[model samples]
Target: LDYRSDTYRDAYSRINAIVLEGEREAHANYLTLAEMLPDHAEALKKLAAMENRHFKGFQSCARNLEVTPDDPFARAYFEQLDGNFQQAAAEGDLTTCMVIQALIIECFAIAAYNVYIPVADAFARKVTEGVVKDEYTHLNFGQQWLKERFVTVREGIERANAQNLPIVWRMLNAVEADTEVLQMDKEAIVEDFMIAYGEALGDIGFSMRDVMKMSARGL
Candidate 1:
């Protein structure tokens, strides 16, 4: 479908805005994580570079479609993540911050891209595929780190996962509501996210059911 045309215009605009925001958030998170975890600085920096490239790619797409990518949803999402990161850092809970970034945020990105890929045009599909690959790599890095750390500090890992569940749920709800404005399939997106996120958490020794229960509660 030609996103520049009327039929796809609304979907294009909404998805493009979300993609831009996600790229921007990823860029900032990788940079901050690199500084916070100097031992993994090189890898994190590389991930940050990828996020910049993705952001520019999406920006070009938006411009080509004659759509100005605005920050109505992006700003609020970024603030939520940033606020959570700050709180975690203040408590010396870097692992919690990483869990929120990787397990929750990156997993959501993967799921979102998956939803977009099948419906996107060739160029957009290719770009989204590349992004999915990179996000997978980033999430793998996070899972490995968590596996090692949680081996000894299992309780802390559980607590961190529980604490961030509702926050992540809120972020997803915000995105879903925005996408609904464009008549997008918000249910499929959420289902995809839950599947990806649940599997990822399971791989890292967390219960998907438990996570869902916590996320279902009010913040």
Candidate 2:
């Protein structure tokens, strides 16, 4: 929690890397969406653009703190999901792709930023606010997209959740120690995610019982 301490900076090396890497990936993730859902390609480009700004915004957070972000660790942290995203694309499963980027990853960012704001530096705090609203736009698009087709694609959503849901848990826990030094609570992030993700699922037309059933595995 001590911003001036070397120990804090040491953990920050990865902490902010996760944030930056998240945005970096989201940029790529939305582009993948555009390619798959060509109907939304133009607007999706804007979402992709927003992610890069977020990447730089958080990068500036690291810059301000004078901590060089540990991209290797961050990439490794997301490798499982990152690789899985590509596989879903290769398999030509748009439903799987949306579930990964929108439902899982975007919601995760919103949840993370919620906890991070109170502890963040001034520039990054405002930056997160800006990015999160954009994050919600992307999240809502997925929700509405899936909601419109929920009856048709619920199975795809379930299948995608089964494969990808656990990865985010792994991603979060792997950084638990880092979050502690940065004054962010990992459980708080997880709790926030559960609520947010459940609402997201509800928006996508999953019944409360189904939401509970799907969420149980995250534990």
Candidate 3:
């Protein structure tokens, strides 16, 4: 269907709302997290700022559109994953929690943008796609910054990681444990997430072996 159609516009709006709410939450949590991890505080603060920008982008597109955006999809999506950010933050696993969150969100953002960009539909898609581009940049920055710190404080970092990895792995596994929001056998979606997630990790010198190690530990 043409994006100008009401149906397409409605779906786009709902998606934008979902993205907005998610980004808004991330921004707030990142601000809180920043105060806790001073060494990597700047990286997170920058992320929070970028999420604010992303939220704005989605808002702008929604406002300029002809038809009102859909709320059903947005509501459903948010209902499923809203609590995860707070839970992870509460665990006090700084390096592992923050990095994993960044990577997962970045992976989804890139995949979402790449999928939408080709379709070339609404003005919202254009804005979202651009935001996704910026998210990748933020992801790259976070990955590199974390790596530098991990190197500098190898023992402490290793100890923290050893303690945190199992916790994070379980959290990541439970990300959608209660909700069937991401349907099983959704290969296209799975591929999109896995590839981006893997690529982002690889960019920071983490291998699939590293991921597997965590997974094998009952994650």
Candidate 4:
């Protein structure tokens, strides 16, 4: 797997496209959430701004690499997930919205960065590291909010988690499908992701067992 080969370029283009799409979705989601939950508007706004910066960063990388930057695969996949997110927000299911945005999406983002950062070129790695740091902060804020809110709404949190598990699994599987082209070790990457995801979820009071089950079922 030559890093400079066309295959690598295509793989990276798709990856960057996916990141760009995810950041755009996150920006939109956080903006909407800030409006819906005015009390957290400041925090949400900050997150939205960070996501915008991340989107630009990825866009820059894609352009710099001279690859066809848009990925239809990522576009279709994220559009579906974005629809679910929009519906959740419209229904005023804030818990479900946060679960989808923070836990599921952000967890996957972290996993992706972990896999890519090690193999990325200097500039790409630097950009990925900065974005990953922002993502960690976003994830932490979301988990903290959930932890505080779940004191009286634990059941709702559980229900939301259950509902989104399948979607999460599907997203991960789709990511795995692209790994071969990227020359990534699917098993190793997935295992590392499980550890990172579990730790992230544990802080917010969710069980990794259920997440692992859904991942296996998808496989």
Best by TM-score: 2
Residue 137, candidate 4: Cα error in Å is 4.2
Q: Model 4 misses residue 189 by how many Å?
A: 3.3
Candidate 1 off by > 4 Å: 5-11, 137-139, 177-183, 207-219
Supply candidate 3's per-residue lDDT for 167. Answer: 44
- Which tens-of-lDDT digit does each residue in 110-155 have in candidate 4? 8778887877777777998998887765545567778787666556
Local accuracy by lDDT, each model: 0.71, 0.84, 0.58, 0.75
What lDDT tens digits, residue by residue, belong to model 2 across residues 108-185?
888889998898777778887887776755535666778899989999998888898888898888888888887889
lDDT by residue (115-200, candidate 3, tens digit) is 55655446756786788768655555546656667555334333434454354333334333211232222344446866665565
lDDT of 1 by residue, 121-165 (tens): 667678778878876655456667776776665566567767776
Residue pairs whose backbone atoms clash in candidate 3: none
Pick the lDDT winner.
Answer: 2
Q: Would you list the rank order by lDDT, best first? A: 2, 4, 1, 3
Residue runs of model 4 more than 4 Å from their true location after superposition: 137-139, 206-219
List the RMSD of every prediction in angstroms. Answer: 2.9, 1.5, 5.9, 2.6
Query: All candidates' TM-scores?
Result: 0.82, 0.94, 0.68, 0.87
| Poorly placed runs, candidate 2 (over 4 Å) | 137-139
